[PDB]
Design an enzyme around this catalytic site. Sequence first.
Site, PDB file in Angstrom:
ATOM      1  N   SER A   1      60.042  47.305  -8.221  1.00  0.00           N
ATOM      2  CA  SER A   1      60.164  46.105  -7.596  1.00  0.00           C
ATOM      3  C   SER A   1      58.335  46.018  -9.018  1.00  0.00           C
ATOM      4  O   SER A   1      57.859  45.490  -9.312  1.00  0.00           O
ATOM      5  CB  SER A   1      58.847  47.665  -6.625  1.00  0.00           C
ATOM      6  OG  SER A   1      58.420  46.625  -5.602  1.00  0.00           O
TER       7      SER A   1
ATOM      8  N   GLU B   1      68.635  42.931  -1.417  1.00  0.00           N
ATOM      9  CA  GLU B   1      66.829  43.376  -1.782  1.00  0.00           C
ATOM     10  C   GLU B   1      66.045  42.717  -0.495  1.00  0.00           C
ATOM     11  O   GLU B   1      64.760  43.403   0.067  1.00  0.00           O
ATOM     12  CB  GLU B   1      66.464  42.683  -2.943  1.00  0.00           C
ATOM     13  CG  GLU B   1      67.006  42.543  -4.300  1.00  0.00           C
ATOM     14  CD  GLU B   1      66.688  43.786  -4.612  1.00  0.00           C
ATOM     15  OE1 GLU B   1      65.897  44.461  -4.145  1.00  0.00           O
ATOM     16  OE2 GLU B   1      66.579  43.832  -5.641  1.00  0.00           O
TER      17      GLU B   1
ATOM     18  N   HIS C   1      66.326  47.536  -1.323  1.00  0.00           N
ATOM     19  CA  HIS C   1      65.406  47.441  -2.298  1.00  0.00           C
ATOM     20  C   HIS C   1      64.913  48.799  -2.731  1.00  0.00           C
ATOM     21  O   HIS C   1      64.045  49.588  -1.412  1.00  0.00           O
ATOM     22  CB  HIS C   1      64.448  46.779  -1.361  1.00  0.00           C
ATOM     23  CG  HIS C   1      62.906  46.761  -2.481  1.00  0.00           C
ATOM     24  ND1 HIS C   1      63.612  45.479  -3.663  1.00  0.00           N
ATOM     25  CD2 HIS C   1      61.521  46.195  -2.860  1.00  0.00           C
ATOM     26  CE1 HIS C   1      62.392  45.192  -4.393  1.00  0.00           C
ATOM     27  NE2 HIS C   1      61.286  45.773  -4.184  1.00  0.00           N
TER      28      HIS C   1
END
EC number: 3.1.1.7
Lengths: 534, 534
Positions: B199, B326, B439
């Site tokens: 991330s 995601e 995610h």
Amino acid sequence: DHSELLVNTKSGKVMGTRVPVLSSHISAFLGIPFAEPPVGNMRFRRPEPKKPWSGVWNASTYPNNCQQYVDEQFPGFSGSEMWNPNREMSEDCLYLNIWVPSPRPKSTTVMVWIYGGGFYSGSSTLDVYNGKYLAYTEEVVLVSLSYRVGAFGFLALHGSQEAPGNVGLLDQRMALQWVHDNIQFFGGDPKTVTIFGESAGGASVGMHILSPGSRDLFRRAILQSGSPNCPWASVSVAEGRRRAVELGRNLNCNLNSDEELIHCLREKKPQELIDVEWNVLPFDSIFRFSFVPVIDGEFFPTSLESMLNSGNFKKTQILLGVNKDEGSFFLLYGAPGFSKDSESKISREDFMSGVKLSVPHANDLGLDAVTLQYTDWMDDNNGIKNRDGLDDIVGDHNVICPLMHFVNKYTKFGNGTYLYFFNHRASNLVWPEWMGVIHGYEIEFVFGLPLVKELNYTAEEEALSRRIMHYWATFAKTGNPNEPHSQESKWPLFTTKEQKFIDLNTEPMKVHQRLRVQMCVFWNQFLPKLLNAT
Amino acid sequence: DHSELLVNTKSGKVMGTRVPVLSSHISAFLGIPFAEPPVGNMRFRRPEPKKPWSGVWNASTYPNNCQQYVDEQFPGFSGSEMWNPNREMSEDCLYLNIWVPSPRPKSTTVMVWIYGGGFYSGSSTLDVYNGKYLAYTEEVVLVSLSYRVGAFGFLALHGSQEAPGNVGLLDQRMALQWVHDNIQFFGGDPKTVTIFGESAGGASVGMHILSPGSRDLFRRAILQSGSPNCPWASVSVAEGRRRAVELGRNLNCNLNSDEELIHCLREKKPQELIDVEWNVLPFDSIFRFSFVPVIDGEFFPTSLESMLNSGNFKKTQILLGVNKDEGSFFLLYGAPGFSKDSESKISREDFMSGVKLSVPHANDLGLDAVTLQYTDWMDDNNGIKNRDGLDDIVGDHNVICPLMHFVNKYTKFGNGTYLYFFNHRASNLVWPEWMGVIHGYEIEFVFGLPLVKELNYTAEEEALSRRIMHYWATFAKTGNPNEPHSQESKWPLFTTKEQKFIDLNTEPMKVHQRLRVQMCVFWNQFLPKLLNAT
Ligand SMILES: *[C@@H]1O[C@H](CO)[C@@H](O[C@@H]2O[C@H](CO)[C@@H](O)[C@H](O)[C@H]2NC(C)=O)[C@H](O)[C@H]1NC(C)=O
Ligand SMILES: *[C@@H]1O[C@H](CO)[C@@H](O[C@@H]2O[C@H](CO)[C@@H](O)[C@H](O)[C@H]2NC(C)=O)[C@H](O)[C@H]1NC(C)=O
Ligand SMILES: *[C@@H]1O[C@H](CO)[C@@H](O)[C@H](O)[C@H]1NC(C)=O
Ligand SMILES: *[C@@H]1O[C@H](CO)[C@@H](O)[C@H](O)[C@H]1NC(C)=O
Ligand SMILES: C[C@@]12CCN[C@@H]1Nc1ccc(O)cc12
Ligand SMILES: C[C@@]12CCN[C@@H]1Nc1ccc(O)cc12
Ligand SMILES: [Cl-]
Ligand SMILES: [Cl-]
Ligand SMILES: [Cl-]
Ligand SMILES: [Cl-]
Ligand SMILES: [Cl-]
Ligand SMILES: [Cl-]
Ligand SMILES: [Cl-]
Ligand SMILES: [Cl-]
Ligand SMILES: [Cl-]
Ligand SMILES: [Cl-]
Ligand SMILES: [Cl-]
Ligand SMILES: [Cl-]
Ligand SMILES: [Cl-]
Ligand SMILES: [Cl-]
Ligand SMILES: [Cl-]
Ligand SMILES: [Cl-]
Ligand SMILES: [Cl-]
Ligand SMILES: [Cl-]
Ligand SMILES: [Cl-]
Ligand SMILES: [Cl-]
Ligand SMILES: [Cl-]
Ligand SMILES: [Cl-]
């Protein structure tokens, strides 16, 4: 009244000829005049009704074809020559042909054919238009009209009365008026007339549905691969004027006034106007023609879009559809990389050249939008995918999506819609396989050529032609292509909600929904918003 | 040198603790300081190097977590709380943790973890980040750093030296400098350091590759679901300033000068800045965070795009990839129609609300473009299709397509790229099935949680974690994830021409090409051109 081949109409007596058809015979009245020859100072003017004659008119042989551009890209090749004038060309060409069952009916269904050819060409006398098979097999009185094309039928200098524009559409309306007034004497029922046409003819049919001055002259309508709102079917009055002036500039005409221009254009022989016709298009493009209908505020009260939105049009039943590969013809004739004797696998460079040619009015963002939409980026260098993708671009943008917009706008107010997708590749086709199911090739099935053995169609193709001829005729007769109380499968009605349609091939009937929605939402909603913002 | 848990570094002596791991044990030095506490007048300023200490530093217990927004959307729910600070929060939080194999290696491969959390959150002490499994199983010295997040690490008033911006990135660089200078004493080889993160951490890794001031401090890089060029990862200096001023306006600060503003922001307690943090975003949006890196002309010489184009960046090997879904996390938390305990089937209205939220910077044409692209018009009212389509919009726009642009720009100059697509849904997942492969959920496999029986993963999942841990470690060690002279299938190298990548799941390895090209050509080439023209 003496003989079956003699008919007395409101315009005078007419003498026909007996014609053989599938082991039997019927009558044909060919070359009947419906307007005075638009010659001399008449060129570019509205049509004048034919002055009645004494004696008997000889209606035994086809009439002349209107002056037009002649295609010689493939000299001797039947595939292209079957569309060219097969009669002598002349400005004296406003005639109609009638095929009457025998014995003469009293009051039967009537079908009037309006030929296509992008408003720059076409003839009522072509072999694929011989109406005797249809008239005979379905017992309908079959009429085929003619109308001025090219500069002759569409030169437009709005404001002037010497060349106002749309006179070729007015030629069609006068032929329809004559049918309304005299088809009864031939056994036809003027209250049950169906007009049908392909390409510019189908767009014409849709224009007669729109124009308030034409509505009362027919009952129902059939449109094949054409729609009034097609991007190539009309131009604003400004553009028409601009092109008329540019035509004049190509013949070294005086351009000081409309009178000067018009007089000059009238002094030129036909072939002189035809020879520079293509020089007036505003862009390098395909599927674009020089002289076409103009949104004049008369024949067309307002913009086609506002008329479709307000429901300002004739409400009745309509039967329409498209072929699977409408674009192949136009790419073969003008897009780089395509040729008649090649598989025409296209390179990424020619694909892009083709997008530019296909959406001439688009800016770069628009061209990219189109390319993105029709490119498989997981295999962007596949020559067959580039070729087929470009084929769909031309067909979707020029025929299918405009027809789907019209179909959807019309259905909200109409009294019944029947939609078809014609996807059968004829077994005796002379064009290459890459062209697929070509623009104009469903016509031969609509006119029954497959029932003629010598033409070499398969047995299943003869069956397909018969179902088609019968859907068309039953629809013209009743407003529904299906037989009342039949065993056969039902072509469902097209509705705003369900949007169903059927395939038209040799396979067992199959129903589908939302014909090409994905691409048509792109062409009808997105791209135009994009072009109007950028 | 006496004990294995005692290490003398250039900053002072440190005392660790023996830690149990899979029936065996290793050493851990937790809470080692690398910068002076950025407290008081230090808030918002560049980090200062930690003054060396006398005596022995107690490195047996994790350090505090940096001040941050705490997520309480699902109180008690592990799925969301496993990401929240599990230690007390404090502005005194610049520490790093080290896991050393036992017996202590002499000069082995080093891996430094950079946590994610959109630059507004994150901790080095989370359970999914416990580096003992990786250190142990692969015999690497595993380091995890920390860095100021939120306003604390990214408040930006360009021009000023009291709050210049990017100080959170500078915190990371100082931890990396300390590793470069002292990891040798722990058995690590400073010339073989691999930085990796997920991330915002993956975007950070990419930012260290770009920033000339950070390049010399690491050998190789791994990026998971993050890229330096992500739309949410940075802002211009104007926008950063604008948000800093707006934060001040939320705390009734004096706004006459930077000094006035900064002094005021410094007088506020932490929770006061956190409490109004989200009020400064310029649009109603998802996947957008308030305080992030600024393109300042210093840490980042020029725009990220020109740096990627000119090849202005560190050239080495990189291993990166994305997860299949995601976007699900961000829609669950803020898009209407989505909820934790529902299948979240979306209505056409919420879909559109979601597109607006997902591409906040877009005008109407752009929103339509996006909708057209992700709508199946043959079934536009399918709630599951609307849900999944919206999921891909968020993931493609925010993670995948930005990473694919970076991957392609980097490969033209790099020394080796390895790309993966992680699509395995954990069997013990507590989130609903509709969220798919979420995610942040490949991390648990990268850190080896599956080998811990009590956590309840299947046997095949334990196998997958091992292959992954070994790809990562072998890559960090050699620049290639594959074993030299192995029997196992080869993760092929990603090339400009072939663009190959592999799936990462429990199935037998499978190679693919051009990860999401269709949608990424849209997001990276088309949409931006469209927004720049309209
Ligand atoms: C086409 O128009 C006809 C007549 O306007 C419609 O028929 C009418 O339908 C309504 C509703 O069933 C009845 O109340 C009338 O009595 C009907 N009139 C007659 C004489 O049938 C017909 O529904 C329309 N068809 C379509 C497809 O729109
Ligand atoms: C990564 O960089 C190395 C070294 O710069 C490349 O190796 C060189 O490759 C060329 C071509 O084969 C040889 O002439 C050199 O002798 C090589 N150097 C060494 C020491 O191996 C390598 O090709 C690069 N790898 C990638 C994937 O780009
Ligand atoms: C009709 O006119 C055509 C013109 O060529 C001619 O061939 C035909 O014999 C004529 N028939 C009659 C009865 O006039
Ligand atoms: C290290 O500090 C922690 C702080 O709570 C303490 O629990 C631990 O016993 C200490 N060990 C030594 C040797 O100081
Ligand atoms: C009627 C045809 C079918 C293809 N041959 C004829 N020529 C032509 C030109 C344009 C058009 O739309 C349609 C046509
Ligand atoms: C590190 C995580 C994974 C999901 N939970 C954590 N919170 C968060 C927020 C933003 C982001 O991009 C990433 C994350
Ligand atoms: Cl015959
Ligand atoms: Cl147009
Ligand atoms: Cl003029
Ligand atoms: Cl021109
Ligand atoms: Cl051309
Ligand atoms: Cl539409
Ligand atoms: Cl439509
Ligand atoms: Cl043929
Ligand atoms: Cl052939
Ligand atoms: Cl034929
Ligand atoms: Cl549509
Ligand atoms: Cl354990
Ligand atoms: Cl952005
Ligand atoms: Cl200020
Ligand atoms: Cl704001
Ligand atoms: Cl939100
Ligand atoms: Cl790209
Ligand atoms: Cl890309
Ligand atoms: Cl879970
Ligand atoms: Cl569940
Ligand atoms: Cl877990
Ligand atoms: Cl791409």
